[PDB]
């Protein structure tokens, strides 16, 4: 798995590959790892698919019940609920989740929650097996307050390299753009990103 | 450890060594391996020291509650079975116990029950428990008679512990003697094995192998 979330001027973009493996067999080559817990709060999932699906479903439930009572939750609040589940059940979970969301007050925010269940607010985050190969590239190429087109290129180039080197990653590059304008899904195929 | 107890004409003799070891290290030479449950009942300590201590003083509390409620001395059978039923509840948890519950009542006469942390409860005439038990058994079996005098019986128990104290590396220090009668137990002193060995060697002519 190769996943990342990047804040930019107009908000935040989540990116992910689509490969799910059982050993060396690709069980699903068109997986959707970008999952929605609220209208403009999404997450990238890595680790145990069962665990991360179960967690996400519980978070979506919590934020739906939160919204019914207290109105739209913050991205920080969503990250807190993720953390609470991951931290308290750390012995029985293998989950590495990046939380990304768009408020109007706070704008684009990215939180990463690694295996232990800690929370780290960052300008951008990378995770999954393929992330190891792009720590150098992403650190050298990331800038704050990029445009939408620049951020899409940054994510596309980054995950392209992660896919190139990581056997556990591959397929299509899915992306979800979170801004004031709304929610936009993007997809990029092998013939496009491999030649980069 | 070496502990023994045997029934005879004059009641019960209880004899124990005094050594406690942690590996090769001799932790103590002055350990009390006879628990005075009450003035009429005695228990021996082998295996786990605390397990024997704790649960046999607890047993004394249960015996006291029995005779308060029933207005009558508890039988050795009943006292031993309270302890055995207790340790049986703990079976598997890792209690370590090998003890003789000794007493002398009207209805039973002199009685000895071997009680075990595996839940074993055996009535018997002669029992020997500990790392030096085999050495004590030899002296006991070859010299034991029902019609022993209280004086000779006390010596036999003392001599049998000495036999074990000499050969068994994890037994020694001193010998504690008790004589259990119907009216209660009687303590017959602490006997240093070092001084006892030379005394017995000379007077008895035994241990010719050893130079003195």
């Amino acid at each position: 798995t190769s996943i990342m979330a990047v804040t930019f001027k107009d908000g935040v973009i989540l990116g992910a590959d689509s490969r799910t493996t059982t050993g060396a067999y690709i069980a699903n080559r068109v997986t959707d790892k970008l999952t929605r817990v609220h209208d403009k709060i999404w997450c990238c999932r890595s680790g145990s698919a069962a665990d991360t699906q179960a967690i996400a479903d519980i978070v979506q439930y919590h934020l739906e019940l939160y919204t019914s009572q207290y109105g739209t939750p913050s991205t920080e609040t969503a990250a807190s609920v993720f953390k609470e589940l991951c931290y308290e059940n750390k012995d029985n979970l293998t989950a590495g989740i990046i939380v990304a969301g768009y408020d109007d007050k706070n704008k684009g925010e990215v939180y990463t929650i690694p295996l232990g269940g800690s929370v780290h607010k960052l300008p951008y985050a990378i995770a999954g097996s393929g992330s190891t190969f792009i720590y150098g590239y992403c650190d050298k190429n990331f800038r704050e307050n990029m445009s939408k087109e620049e951020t899409v290129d940054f994510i596309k180039h980054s995950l392209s390299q992660a896919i190139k080197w990581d056997g556990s990653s591959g397929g299509v590059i899915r992306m979800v753009v979170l801004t004031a304008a709304g929610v936009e899904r993007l997809i990029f195929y092998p013939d496009e990103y491999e030649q980069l | 450890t070496t502990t023994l107890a045997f029934r005879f004409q004059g009641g019960i003799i209880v004899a124990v060594d005094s050594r406690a070891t942690a590996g090769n290290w001799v932790a103590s030479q002055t350990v009390k391996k006879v628990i005075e449950i009450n003035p009429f009942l005695l228990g021996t300590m082998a295996g786990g020291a605390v397990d024997c201590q704790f649960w046999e003083t607890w047993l004394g509390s249960q015996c006291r509650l029995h005779e308060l409620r029933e207005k009558e001395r508890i039988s050795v059978a009943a006292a031993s079975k309270i302890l055995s039923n207790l340790v049986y509840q703990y079976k598997g948890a890792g209690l370590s116990m090998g003890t003789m519950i000794c007493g002398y009542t009207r209805k039973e006469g002199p009685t000895i029950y071997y009680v075990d942390s595996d839940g074993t409860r055996l009535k018997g005439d002669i029992f020997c428990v500990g790392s030096g038990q085999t050495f004590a058994y030899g002296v006991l079996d070859s010299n034991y008679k029902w019609d022993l005098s209280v004086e000779d019986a006390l010596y036999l128990g003392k001599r049998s512990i000495l036999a074990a104290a000499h050969r068994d590396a994890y037994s020694g220090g001193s010998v504690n003697l008790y004589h259990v009668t119907e009216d209660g137990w009687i303590y017959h002193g602490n006997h240093d094995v070092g001084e006892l060995f030379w005394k017995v060697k000379e007077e008895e002519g035994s241990f010719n192998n050893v130079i003195g």
């Binding site: 690694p114 295996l115 232990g116 800690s118 780290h120 | -």
Partner: protein, 233 residues
Amino acid sequence: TQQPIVTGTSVISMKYDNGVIIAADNLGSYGSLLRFNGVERLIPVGDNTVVGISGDISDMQHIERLLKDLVTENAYDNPLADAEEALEPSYIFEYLATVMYQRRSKMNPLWNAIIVAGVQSNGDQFLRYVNLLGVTYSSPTLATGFGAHMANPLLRKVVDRESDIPKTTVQVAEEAIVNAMRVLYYRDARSSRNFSLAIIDKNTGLTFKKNLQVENMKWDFAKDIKGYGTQKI
């Protein structure tokens, strides 16, 4: 029972004549990966106490929330919350020490080593240690992890016993701490150049210094070192 995932390395500290100093780098390691470079591991409680934490970061964040909650709770129905009935370093430590030992006794420890540094109401210096086992001890100098092996020897040359504390100024104490942090950067593979330092003085109060860097490093001699024995070029 768990294993630590995201970890923080050495916390070092020492007493001086009017108070205590404590320091710790801003790194959150992920095994050999130097993952997070902006982690604050010194957490102040009020204006008289600083708790320095090493080990598992997720457990550190949990402890951070317990201390935040402790301040809130102390203020409840307490008119003297900012005066006579404010939280002391000794109260904060004893609470943590209780929690650490309880958690180890349930076979589910907070995987940390903690140093509580502060100044009491009567001006006395407070410096005490507690870890995942609930083991506690106090000393003129205290350090966790690699700091124990490399920082303590250096800090003990300044304050070797109790009688050396009044003779040690804040400038000398801070100098020793900063030098110790440089030594740890040379020699600890799980350390970073960026660190935070906190001074708690009975007169000037709590001074919290962020974004400090290890400087005045010696590397020039490396150019002359060639091969591993016989090689000349």
